Structure formats: structure tokens, C-alpha cells
Subunit: 332 residues, 4 copies
Amino acid sequence: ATLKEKLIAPVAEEEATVPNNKITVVGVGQVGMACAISILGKSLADELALVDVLEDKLKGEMMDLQHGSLFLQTPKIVADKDYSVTANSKIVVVTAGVRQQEGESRLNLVQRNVNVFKFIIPQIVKYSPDCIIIVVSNPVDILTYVTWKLSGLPKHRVIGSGCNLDSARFRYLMAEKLGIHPSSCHGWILGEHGDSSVAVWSGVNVAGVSLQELNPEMGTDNDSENWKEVHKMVVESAYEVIKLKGYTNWAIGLSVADLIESMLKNLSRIHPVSTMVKGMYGIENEVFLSLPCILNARGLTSVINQKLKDDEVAQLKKSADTLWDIQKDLKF
Amino acid sequence: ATLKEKLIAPVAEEEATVPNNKITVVGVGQVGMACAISILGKSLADELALVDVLEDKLKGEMMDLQHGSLFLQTPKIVADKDYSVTANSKIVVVTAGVRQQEGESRLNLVQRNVNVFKFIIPQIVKYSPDCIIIVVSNPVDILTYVTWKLSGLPKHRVIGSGCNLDSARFRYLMAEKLGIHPSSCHGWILGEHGDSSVAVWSGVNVAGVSLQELNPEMGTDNDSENWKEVHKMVVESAYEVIKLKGYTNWAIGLSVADLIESMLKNLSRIHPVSTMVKGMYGIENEVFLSLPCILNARGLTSVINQKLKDDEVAQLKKSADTLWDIQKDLKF
Amino acid sequence: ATLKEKLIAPVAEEEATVPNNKITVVGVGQVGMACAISILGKSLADELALVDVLEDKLKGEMMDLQHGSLFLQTPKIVADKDYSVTANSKIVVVTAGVRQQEGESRLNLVQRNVNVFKFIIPQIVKYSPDCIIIVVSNPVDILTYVTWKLSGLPKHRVIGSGCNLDSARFRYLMAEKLGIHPSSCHGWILGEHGDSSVAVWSGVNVAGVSLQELNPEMGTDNDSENWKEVHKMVVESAYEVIKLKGYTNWAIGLSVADLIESMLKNLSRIHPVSTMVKGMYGIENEVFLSLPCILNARGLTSVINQKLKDDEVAQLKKSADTLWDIQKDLKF
Amino acid sequence: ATLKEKLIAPVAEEEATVPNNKITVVGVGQVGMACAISILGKSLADELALVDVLEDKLKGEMMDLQHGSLFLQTPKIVADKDYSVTANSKIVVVTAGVRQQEGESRLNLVQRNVNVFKFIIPQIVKYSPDCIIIVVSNPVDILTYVTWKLSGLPKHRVIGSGCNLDSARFRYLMAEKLGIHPSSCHGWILGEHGDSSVAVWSGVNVAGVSLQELNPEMGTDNDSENWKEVHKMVVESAYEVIKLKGYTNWAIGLSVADLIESMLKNLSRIHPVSTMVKGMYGIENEVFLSLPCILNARGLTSVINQKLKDDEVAQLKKSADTLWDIQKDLKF
Ligand SMILES: NC(=O)c1ccc[n+]([C@@H]2O[C@H](COP(=O)([O-])OP(=O)(O)OC[C@H]3O[C@@H](n4cnc5c(N)ncnc54)[C@H](O)[C@@H]3O)[C@@H](O)[C@H]2O)c1
Ligand SMILES: NC(=O)c1ccc[n+]([C@@H]2O[C@H](COP(=O)([O-])OP(=O)(O)OC[C@H]3O[C@@H](n4cnc5c(N)ncnc54)[C@H](O)[C@@H]3O)[C@@H](O)[C@H]2O)c1
Ligand SMILES: NC(=O)c1ccc[n+]([C@@H]2O[C@H](COP(=O)([O-])OP(=O)(O)OC[C@H]3O[C@@H](n4cnc5c(N)ncnc54)[C@H](O)[C@@H]3O)[C@@H](O)[C@H]2O)c1
Ligand SMILES: NC(=O)c1ccc[n+]([C@@H]2O[C@H](COP(=O)([O-])OP(=O)(O)OC[C@H]3O[C@@H](n4cnc5c(N)ncnc54)[C@H](O)[C@@H]3O)[C@@H](O)[C@H]2O)c1
Ligand SMILES: O=C(O)c1nonc1O
Ligand SMILES: O=C(O)c1nonc1O
Ligand SMILES: O=C(O)c1nonc1O
Ligand SMILES: O=C(O)c1nonc1O
């Protein structure tokens, strides 16, 4: 009965697995594949599964990751427009939908990307009832909130791609300035991934040397020896890459593998990422925006309480108020 | 009370972890720690566990690894003489017991290591009765059979480390001869890990090209011009080495992680390991010896039925009979 | 008073970085960037330089990677129209110029890319004079040979990505039928990258045991397992995959990179990349083609002399004369 | 006739690799091997040299490592008692010596050991003059300094393992206290490696947030998080581990390999490693202790200019005195 029949001889009995650490990537767009080439690269899934709506573009992104199986450690790769392939996934990376046209704000994609999520979020929990979701599609913090509601999952099992990517954009500009590696530069961007984001100068530092101390001019526009512009650089930066190439992904893709490695390796390491911050720094409502969370195998199991300077909570309320003004009309 | 008390403001229930891929290492001797360190750097455990009777050193070793944790991806490293730490392990590596003295036959350790596996194996299955048991302690094939019989686990969940090593030495000795990577030469040693092993020359190949075809008097009573004395190299290799350094452990440490990697990441790759070979190559008893096997997330699930020449099946039957002879009296 | 002056007290006096592991990628398109990202996650380069005609897009991808830098182990990432950004490159990948149309042969792209290659390559070897060219652009064999003649480079130093990728498909396909990882299947496809690929069935083994002796009508017309349907699917591959998604890239971004591993790490393993085959199996002319060779830090230092069948050899003859028939016409 | 002749056909006529990231690890005891095994598993080296006066043992640790090759990416392992085998080396780790008996403090050692370095250090520079030298043997600053002189290498090429391990014990002990990864726990134990180290409590942060600027008791007599107790452990550590298992190797070994990664990858990350301190916080003696410092392919190339309080710099100076006192009378 072929070769498998009288070449392989079962010591067991056939046999099914049950995925252990499966991961669905939802969307096989420029972002969807970056995340996917990077999950596969760090060897993070025993099974990787693709769901997109474009059936043809899927079978071929599926097929393409398939051919390289021999360089990779992910026995099962799979793909369908039916969400039945995502069954029993441990982490689900949503990326699907429309992206910013050159100039367009992330926040002008809500109406549209919400309608996407209105369909795809609840088919994910049908198939993987006990998953962690990662939300990457834009209005990311607004949709992390939309995902939270529709999924009907705990808060520690719904995670915003957040300002993990912002904070690395930041630690990378700091790193150029200093001529070291960003692993060795520390410092944080919290709140809305994008325009309304907050630089926390209090905590910018290198080998413990607070630089809000080593120049308290730091962050104060006009004055200062340069720091204002670094934050603007981070903020503007999404737009500045879109002008030149069309979109971003190699950095988002790696951010996400980061997030997933921390979690599937149960490391409890710290990540600035979008969560529900009701009841912190004076916040009226159920607003999702990023803060230094502890990612382990549970999902995000804590936030970190920081002494912020007065101005930085001011900036963070302006953010959470913006986001809450779109979420209060949302109703689904 | 401690800063955790409100440096960390949880989003998930204090709650109840449970390790995914936990791994236990019964024994913290030279071999034992070799396995622990190789395991640790490939990052295969999200919990390591070290058992032993030497209660102090044991705690020496744990604390020493712990100190390294910054450089690993292993959140929990515990250790006690009490098989109550090993609870929930996906894999238990048993290096426990006595080893060779300068000269000593692996087969001569059987009475003593039997008597250990006797009062240790029920303790392993108590706290973890769905764990793949890797037997390393010698003689390894017989204690694989002894582990099977005491443990009540199925054939595919007791795996002797077997010829994964002999065969790596052989591929390396091969490679030496030719100027390439071990990985790029191929060639199996099956049989008793030790004196009576079998160089399946039929299969020795590079780029698919069969070297016995290229050298028909290979592995042959005198005539060849290099071969038999490599198999003689592969046999005496432990004895050559224990003599200069007291013991072996890095090689075998590293094999036991090659098997561990392929099982946890579910890769379904072929290793010659020690599995029950009744019925094969006309074998009438439940001997455990080494043959090409597929190891996946379930353990040892397949044996590759082979086309051994009339004197490979011969020398194979001869390792069989020799192990069964030492096995037949055990009677526990 | 530059923030560096204040924070970093130099010890070795000012930078002058000894480049070392430069890798250039020519052409930041789909393939270009699959190679790039795949190189980055294996930390093979400590400098990456991209080149391309498309000034905007090029700056975008450099930027995009840069931003990921925190997630990486590549200190420097640069990019520019000029070949001067590629100086000292230990290994350079040319992936630029046109590609298939839905249905178009790889050789139908020749004249176009030769004219690219004509003003790309001289430039490459002005600036990285001691380097290893890895030619992805298609047709990959004939372009490897055109690279060879123009660059002047020792022939070992011009490696075509060849049939590394096909055998990697052919090993995945055979892996599905058998239910093991591709790594544990073994089976070469040699020759031209396109439709003359030969699948050397002599070699096709698993754990030593030839799948031909198992089945001696392998890869002929009527046979039980229908082995030609695998080799045909391996030829069809690119066509099917493009038809669904406009290109292939990932699986090739992986192989380019798997080969680079073998070089920079100096492993001497055997890949079926493309190499000048004059001398071999009757071939009288300077033909590039894919035979199992050894890669190390010198590049392609040795071919494995295989013991191929009569029919199998004809086929190389087939392949080597379609290639040579294009090749001779080229205005040099 | 040689099978390498029937099988291998040389494309580049004449094999012979140029030396490259040859690393050497001096002495093959507990620390020797443990550094080695961690260097090998991080795929950092294409030539491992082992050196040691006990030939016999040394040819075993050479061999036990050679057998493991298949599982590695380090194509030449070699060992000999003549430092010839360490020619054209790039990094050389010095672990040879004698070590503390239970109770012994690290200065009991200088005499016997300084006869040790007096032998070897030249023989490094004799055979491998263009190198970085990592120093681990005790007493380790007093021998670092001893190495700077003997070798007569530039400041930036002689580094001691120094406080790296301590700040790793530190960051790990901190980790237990908050339940995150020592890699999200930031903190610096600087100065002399043994009893005299110095916890810079200002740096000690987590996620941007200063700890001292939260609980100002830190470091004094009776603090209520008990933090002088932590530094306490980071100091006692060595001793208390030596009481259980006679020595340490693993922690040290991984951390040496971390330096070796930083530097081969030319990564310019910071590491609390030992280096010449005069001109820093008022040293007048030619003496080495561990400060935050930048580790690329040039070696240690700069330090971090930090603001350090009285009772620390004091701590530093008495350290740097005791240091010189031994030193001054060193019949070089
Ligand atoms: N949060 C972040 O840090 C971050 C960063 C970069 C990009 N993004 C966002 O991620 C998204 C993806 O980026 P991209 O460049 O891959 O976009 P893309 O156009 O390249 O990909 C679109 C993908 O989503 C699918 N899609 C479109 N409409 C859909 C629908 N109704 N239902 C299901 N799938 C649909 C497409 O088939 C395709 O798979 C964008 O919205 C982008 O803004 C977020
Ligand atoms: N399969 C292989 O390729 C291979 C290779 C090398 C060594 N080995 C085996 O390793 C075993 C030990 O080798 P080693 O050099 O580590 O010796 P070792 O002396 O260094 O280690 C023995 C350890 O076992 C512990 N121990 C003894 N009885 C125990 C028990 N009943 N329960 C729990 N722990 C117990 C001891 O504390 C000691 O720490 C030997 O059987 C030897 O054959 C196997
Ligand atoms: N060997 C293989 O396994 C394999 C597989 C897939 C594709 N390919 C080949 O790879 C090549 C690239 O494929 P692709 O999918 O990236 O197409 P692509 O459209 O994505 O790549 C085009 C790139 O070529 C660049 N380019 C054109 N002229 C240039 C010049 N004169 N100097 C520098 N850069 C120039 C463009 O500016 C652009 O960046 C094609 O030739 C394709 O056929 C080979
Ligand atoms: N800096 C750190 O963080 C750190 C940590 C642990 C150990 N150490 C030091 O490392 C050293 C040994 O550690 P160990 O546990 O491996 O000791 P070990 O006994 O296990 O290793 C000693 C090795 O040094 C060799 N040696 C002795 N005299 C020699 C000589 N004259 N020439 C060449 N080699 C010689 C021996 O042959 C042996 O190979 C001690 O100095 C110890 O304090 C430093
Ligand atoms: O973060 C980005 O770069 C981004 N790109 O598209 N949307 C975004 O948010
Ligand atoms: O083969 C070995 O390495 C060995 N050494 O001691 N026991 C063994 O199995
Ligand atoms: O085979 C492929 O992947 C391919 N697609 O376009 N050129 C190629 O070589
Ligand atoms: O720090 C240590 O662990 C140490 N142990 O022995 N010597 C040392 O330096």
C-alpha cells in the first residue's frame, strides 16, 4: 500500500496530534507574511495556519512557506478561507483588512476595519475558544477594544501590538545617537501607537543613568540638545516609510514574533503593549492603550504602575480621551 | 509589602501555571548536567527539574544554573530528591546510576542499575504518567526494557538513547575521512549501544551515492582499505575516552537534546534509538536495541523497515541474542 | 558635550570598523527582501547593504529593517543606488531585474537580465573585490555563467542558487507521502532550475533504504506510487505558485540563506547549487548546472562525483544542451 | 584511489581554509568545558582550540567534543599542550589555574596562579598576537591587570569576566522577588568580582521606573524590602555554591559566551566587565575593575561615564588599593 505501508512500520497507532503551540496568522498581506516569516524563523509553531479572504493568494502563500519546510521546524503549515483551519490555535495574529493610503490616518480606517473584525473575531473564538489574540490591524488600540468585546475573552487574553513597535523605533534612534545596540538602550513610548503617543523621558536611560537627570532640558521643545525630535521621528515614522515603499511590516513582523516568543516561552518579560487602562492615571473608561505589561504563557498577566511626571499623564489622558470618543459611538 | 505588592498591578488572576514542555533530568552527574546545559541553551524547557540522592550537590547545580537565567529562556529550575518536583514533565531524562570504570563493559552495570531503576521508576510515573522516558544510564538497551516493564507506559513512550551517539561518532569519523560536515555524510550504526553494534554499510552514502557500491569490499574481512577499523573506532570510543577523562558526557549530553528537540518541536525525524524489536529481522524476543525510528511529539512512532544485507541481519541478530541473554535472567 | 561625549568615555580611540561579515542584497523586490529578512533572523551579517535602482523603495526597506533592529543582531544596515554601499561584502546576492509572467519560461527572461547583469556586475567587483556572488535572478544557471565570465571570479566564487530550492520542494513532497520531516527524506534534483530538472532516483533514500530497490520502476511511466507526479509537481511549482500570487519568494529567501549559513559558518555541506559542469558526464562546454557540491567559507570548493544511471545522465545531457544552446549566442 | 578521490572532485583546486573566528579556551576543567560547551552551542566558533598541561584529560575533552559534531556548527575542534594549536586565534579565554577550596576567598590565589599566567599569557600572544583575551581565572582582576602587562596588548583587547556574572546573579535574585525575567530586571553590581562589589542602587530599575525613587530605604541598614540582603547573596553565592558542588562553571560559562557573542557579532552592547579604571572616580593606580562597557569586535572599547555617590567610589578605591598592594610587589 505504497511505501509508507511497508517502509514505515508503526510502533504506535495512527494517530492524531492535537496542536500544542499552533499559531494562526489572519491575513497574508505585507504584514501577515512578515509576521509569518518571523514566527517560522524563530521556530515558534509546530503548526502555522493562514486565514485570509483571498483564497488564491492564500493557497500560494501557504504553498510558498510549504516548499521551505526543510529549513524550518514547523511540521504542519495550512491555509483556508474557512476559519475551520484555525481550530485549537494558541495565539492568533490578526492583520487583515485595509491599510492607510499615503497620508490617511490610522484612525480613519475604523468604520471599515471594524466591519472586518465584526466578522473575523467571533469566528476565531468559535474555533480556538482558549486563545490569546494579537491585534495588529489599525485602529489597533480601538480594535484591540473591539476585539475584546466581540471575542468575549478575558483582558489578559487580548493584546494590542501596541507601542512595542514604537518603542523599538525609539530605542533605535537613541541607539544611533549613542552608537550602541538598542538592547542596551532603554526607554518607552506608551498610549496610542501613533500620533498621540507619549515619550516617557523619566525612564529613558543607559546602564541606569537616567537622562531626564543628565539633562532636564530633555523633552522640552525649543530648548534641549535634540530630544524633542526623536519622539516626533518615531511618531511621523510610519508615514515616512509609506511615502517611500507603500506600507510597513519587517519591524511589525519582528515585534510580533517577540511578543509570541516571550509568551509561548512563558518568560514573563516586559513589553509596552495595548491593554484596558480603566482605573489607571485617572482614566474615565474602557480604553485600550499601551503600557509596560508582563508577557507570559497566560497572555498579558500584569501592567506596571509607573510614577509618571504630571505632563505625561496629561498626554496620556488626551490619548485615552481621543480613543474613547470613537468607542462611545461604536455600539455593536 | 515588597514592591511587587504594587509595582505589579495584575490583569490576570494570581492563579495556577502548569508547564507546557517541562523536562526532568534524573541525575546530576557529569552526564546529567551535560544534558541539563544542552537542554537549557537550545531553550527546550520552560521548566527544568533536577533529581538526585546527593541532596547538597543537587542544590549546588540548581543554584548554579539559576544564576545563569538572564542568559536562558527557562523560567523555573527546581530540584529535589523527591520525585514530587518532576510532576507534569513532558520528558524525563534518566542519567541516574553507576557508570563504567576504566575498562568496564556497559553490560556489567546491569545488576546495580537495574536495582536503581527499580526503586526510582515508580516514582517517575507517579508524578508524571504521560511522560516520554529517555533512558541513558547503562547498559542502556536493557534498562530501556527494564524501564518499559516497570513503568507501564507504551512502547512509544520509553526511548533508549541508543545509537543516536555511536552513529554521530561514525558520521564524524566518516566526515574526517572526506572533508565535509557530519550532517552531510550518512551512515547508521544500529544494535547494542556498545560492544556488539552494527555498521549498516549498505546505507553509508554521500549525496545519495552508495559507498559500498563504490567499494564492494567495504567493511569486509580484511580487504577494504579503511572501513572495518572505523566501526572498531566507534565501539572503543567510550573506552578510549573514559580512560583519558574518567567518563564521557558532552557528546551524549548533546545527543539527548537532539532527540528532545525532535520530540518537543514535533518534527518527526529519524534517529536510531533503542526500541522493542520483537518480530524484526527474525527476532523472537522483546529485546530493545537501536533502529531508525521516527520521533515526534508523541515519542517514538515508527521504525524504518530496512534492506540489510545477509550479514548485516546476521550481525544484527547477534546483538539481539547477546542482549536477550543478559535480559533473560533479570527476573525482578 | 554631544550626549555621547558625556556618557561614553572611549577606551580604544574612535571607530574604524573592520567590516568582516558584509552581505549585500542586490534588488529589494519580493525576492530581494525575503533573502534580507531571512538573513537577519539567522544573524549571518553584521552589516547588510541593499542596492537597487528604485531610490525611494530602497530607502523604505532599509528604514523598515533598521526599525526592527532591536529584534535583531545586525549592527549596520545601509542602502544606496551606488555600489559603494556594498564594499567588502563577503557574500553578495544578486536578485535584481525582471521575473516570470503567468506562464513565461525562466529562460524567456534571459536577454533582459543579461543586460542588467552587464552593468550590475562589473560594479559589484569594483567595490567588493574578494567576494562570493550568489545569483538568484533567472534564468539562474545561465546568469550564473554570465556572472562568471564578467566578474572574472574564480568559478568556486560564483554560486547559482540553482536546485537547492527544487530538491527542497522535492523533499517536502516526498516527506508528505511518508509523513516525516523533509530533513529525513533524501533525494536530489539536479540540473537546470527550470523544466529539465532531473530527479536522480538512484539517490532518493530515507534512513539509507533506497526507494528504488524498494520500488525499481521508480519514476518511469506506469508504476504503483507514481513517482513522476512528484518530479512534475516540482517543475510546475513555480508556475502554479505565481499563478496564485504573482511570484515566489519565501522558500527561496530561505534557501539563499541556508546556503549562506554554510558559507559564513564554514560547514562544508552538500547542496545542489549550480556550478560550472565542464568535464562532467560528457559535457564539452562551459555550462552551469546544479550538482551536489560542498559549500564553505571559500564558497563552492568541491563537487560530489555521483554514480548516475544511463537515462539520468542522458537528462543532464538534455539540460546541458538546452542551456548551452542559449549560452553560446551571448554578445560579450 | 583514496575514496575522497573517487567521491570528491575539487572545484577550487586545493582545500585550505584561511583561519577565522577560531576561539581558544585555555584549560579544560569545570569552567573550561562549560565555557566551551556554551560557545559551541551558540555556534560562535569555526575553530575551537583547547589548551592544557594535563595532556591526557585534554585529549578526552577534545574527543568527547569532537564526537558531538553532527549537533554543532563548529567544523574543527582541536586540542594540544603546545600553544601552537591556538595560532591565529581571535578570542582566547583564560580559565587555567587553581581555585578556591571551600572557605577560601579569591585572593588566596595570586601567588600559585600568577606563576600560571606568567607561563601562559606570552604563549597566547606568541601564537595569536592579534587577539582579544577574556580572563576568568582567579583572582581575576589582579590577573586581568597581570595579563595587560605580560601580553602587552592594548587596553581594549584585555577584558576580565569580572562582575558580569554578579550582575547576572543580581538580576536573577531581583527576578525571584518580582517574578519576571532577569532580562526585564535591570541592575548593576560593579567593581571587584568577590566580596567587595558595589550595588549601584540608582540604576536598579524595572520598566522605566526607578526603585530607589520609590523605596528610598534601599541599600541602608534596615530597609523593609531587605535589599542589602540581595547584594549579600550576590557576594556569598560563590562560597555557598562551592559548599554544595565544589565549584561553579555553568553561570560563569554562559556569561563568558555572552561576551563572546557580543563581540564576534560586533554588537556593541554593554557589559559590566573589568578594565583599566584610572581617571575614573580618582583612581591613581594601574588597576582593573568592572564598569559598564561596550563590547564589539574590537573588544572593550569604551566605558560608561556615570554619576557615582561617595560610599560607592569609596567602596571602589579601597577595592583598588587592596588590588594595588598585592600588585606593587609583583616580581614581574
Ligand atoms: N499596529 C501596527 O503596529 C501596524 C503596523 C503596520 C501595519 N498595520 C496594519 O495592519 C494591516 C495590514 O497591513 P498590510 O500592509 O498587510 O495590508 P495589505 O493590503 O498588504 O493586506 C490586506 C490583507 O487583509 C486582507 N483583507 C482586506 N480586506 C479584508 C476583509 N474584509 N476581510 C478579511 N481580509 C481582508 C487581504 O486579503 C490581505 O490579506 C493594515 O491595516 C495596517 O495598517 C498595523
Ligand atoms: N547512553 C549513553 O551514551 C551514556 C553515555 C555516558 C554515560 N552514560 C551513563 O551515565 C550514567 C551515569 O554517568 P555519569 O558519568 O553521570 O556518572 P555520575 O557518577 O557522574 O552520576 C551519577 C549520579 O547518579 C546519582 N544517583 C545514583 N543513584 C540514584 C538514584 N537511585 N536516584 C537518583 N539519583 C541517583 C548520583 O547522585 C550521581 O549524582 C551511567 O549509567 C553511564 O552508563 C550513558
Ligand atoms: N532562483 C529562484 O529560485 C528564483 C525564485 C523566484 C524568483 N526568481 C527571480 O528573482 C528575480 C527577482 O524576483 P522578484 O520576485 O523579486 O521580482 P521583483 O519585481 O520583486 O524584483 C524586482 C527588483 O529588480 C530591481 N532592479 C531592476 N533593475 C535593476 C538594476 N538595473 N539595478 C539594480 N536593481 C534593479 C527593481 O528595481 C526591483 O527592486 C527575478 O528575476 C525572478 O525571476 C528566482
Ligand atoms: N571569574 C569568574 O566568574 C570565575 C568563576 C568560576 C571559577 N573561576 C576560576 O576559574 C578557575 C578554575 O575553575 P575550575 O572550577 O574549572 O577549576 P578546574 O580545576 O576544574 O580547572 C583547572 C584547569 O586548569 C589547569 N591548570 C592548572 N595549572 C595549570 C598551568 N600551570 N598551566 C595550564 N593549565 C593549568 C588544569 O590542568 C585544569 O585543566 C579558578 O581560577 C576559579 O576561581 C572564575
Ligand atoms: O506602525 C506602523 O508602521 C504602521 N504601518 O501601518 N500601520 C501602522 O500602524
Ligand atoms: O558512549 C558513551 O558515550 C558512553 N560512555 O559511558 N557510557 C556510555 O554510553
Ligand atoms: O522556482 C521559483 O521559485 C521561481 N519563480 O520565479 N523564478 C524562479 O526560479
Ligand atoms: O563567581 C564565582 O562564582 C566564582 N567561583 O569561583 N571563582 C569565581 O570567581
